[PDB]
Amino acid sequence: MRFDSDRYRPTDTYAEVACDKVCRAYEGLGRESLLAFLRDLTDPWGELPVGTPPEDACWVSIDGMPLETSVAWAGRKAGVRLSLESPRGPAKRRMEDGMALTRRLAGRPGVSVDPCLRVEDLFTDDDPQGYFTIAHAVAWTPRYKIFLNPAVRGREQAAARTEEAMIRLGLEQPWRALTEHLGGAYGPEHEPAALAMDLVPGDDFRVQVYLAHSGVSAEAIDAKSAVAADHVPGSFARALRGINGADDTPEWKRKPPVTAFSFGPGRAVPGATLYVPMIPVHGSDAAARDRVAAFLRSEGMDAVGYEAVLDAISDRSLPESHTQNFISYRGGDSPRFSVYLAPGVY
Template sequence: MSSSTAVAQASRREGLFDATLSTYRDFACAKWLAIGTALGFSDHHRNTSAAALDALLGEWSDRPVGAACEYPSFVSRDGFPLEFSVSWRAGVPEVRVLFESLGPVPSARAAQDAGRALTRSLADRPGVSLDRYLAIEDLFVVDDPRPFRPTVWHSLAYRPGEPPRYKVYLNPQARGRDAVPEVMAAAMGRLGLAPAWSGVAARYAELAAEGHEVEFVALDLADAPGARVKVYFRHTGLVDLDRVAALARTHDPVLAGPAYRDVYGSPALPDNEPMTCLAFRAGAPGPEEANVYLRLPSEVASEADATERVASVLRRFGADHLRYRAVVAALAPRPLESMVGMQELLSFRTASGRPDLGVYFRFAVYDAAVDGVHA
């Protein structure tokens, strides 16, 4: 954790959800359907999207969650390998799940191998392309990956009336932090994005020294012209939330400022490891968009407090705060005033004048955090 406040509140983040007797698959599908219902999806869209999720989860997800962490996934502080989110792009809701596939044995290598296998299994799905992933995979996988660090993760995103979209997440620190500049230069070169990355690369040593480090890389597994490569920075210490985001062409700090203040107060200088994602597309001279992820648990007194802060941002920018509140109510296992940590992040992106907003939900099911650093 990144601050004493966060450590003090950690006990209220653990063991919120009773999933001991559930399988990972049943737990994931139940939460997916609850979110779809709260967002007002039709029966057809709920069922169609739930079927896509069910088909994506591998055999590992049929194992019981159990009372103790089987393998400590970096997805969540307690090691649970699933995270859900809801976003509003141009006011239209989208539901998403991020997860790490677990291997047949509780090891990082087994999880990495399971993730690689899942990626390849997606090759024949409509609209999916693995070309970019296969071009860079060797840079991000190692023979002996570290436990409680990212391996090869996946996400599924669904908006009513559109086909499911898939994304793969990779760990640029797999070969160590010192190797990140070299790994990123090689990856972006192979992806044809070297010119677009060059401006960020020239500043990377300075950014890292200030506490802005690349922690994830994600690829849209799509054959569409606008498919993105997303580079995620984690920020440590007191940070200027626009420091990395300002590298993106469409980032608007004036528009983003009120959202920062709604969550963090003024001045908005958080010390709880927020994140920023820069999105790159072929043909652009630099990063096109920036998503700033505002971390909530160490800033709020309870989930009720988090809900009011997030709803304030949604109302400010014309997103449906009532549907958002319905999602929170559908997911909460106990009164909102009595817990904290289910709502982990609020994301903010100024891509096209009207901000895109997202809320990320984590489901702490174990009574102890993993022994390691995770905000």
């Protein structure tokens, strides 16, 4: 990986970059305290110089940075979020960094890490495999999330570890409903690629299971979420076809669409949100932007806001920028849209 940035000095720290990106995201939506918060949150690696890329790229950003900025639109409001993952190595050290951060979140206001701690052993190991083990996100209105890799000991065990976690968390009923709807097994068609967890107590607790959809059409992807609590028939197929076009490009096959199924206490079936791959299915952020903006407009959603965030946060002109990871989408009466962005520094 090569450091390459028109905006940052190689001596700027990861924490300082995270602060700048988060601020500019808010600018797009229309500081010393924040930086202190983020330096704290990213301890100790937050102090490291961005000019030296980690020896192993982080799973959390497509440019391999330990940071990914997110803006999420929902219920007529917009919020900024930051995902983070230690850039240290080897994988065992990266893992243990995340374990430490989970425990340092435990005491914070409104935070509950108990459900995380109940299933942590399923997603950690002395000899972790895969591209990641532990990552987190913070969201301001501060609320925290953790991301976990079900393939920590191989893709082969992903479904089993995911299932065992769902059962421990008391979510076997909607997990069974999903599993049955999917045909009873979890192959490449709908493969558990990540699990996430809102670190909060109560009925607001939720778990997301992200399923990657390899070798399957827009229409069949849409059908997989007909079991969901709020899925407009055809809405995912229209998003995938409208934004991302042909499903036979090498780039498509390299980065398949993902559905995040969301589970919570007292909810017999999961929710569903569509993750539409951006880079490298599109040749640049500008090309992605035009196609996403067209879709948002035809859905009556706020494309002006999406483009404002893109322009504020991006360091290079968009036809030469490749920072959009996914957008996420749910249609219906309570629609949702989010954009996920690499810093664009490596």
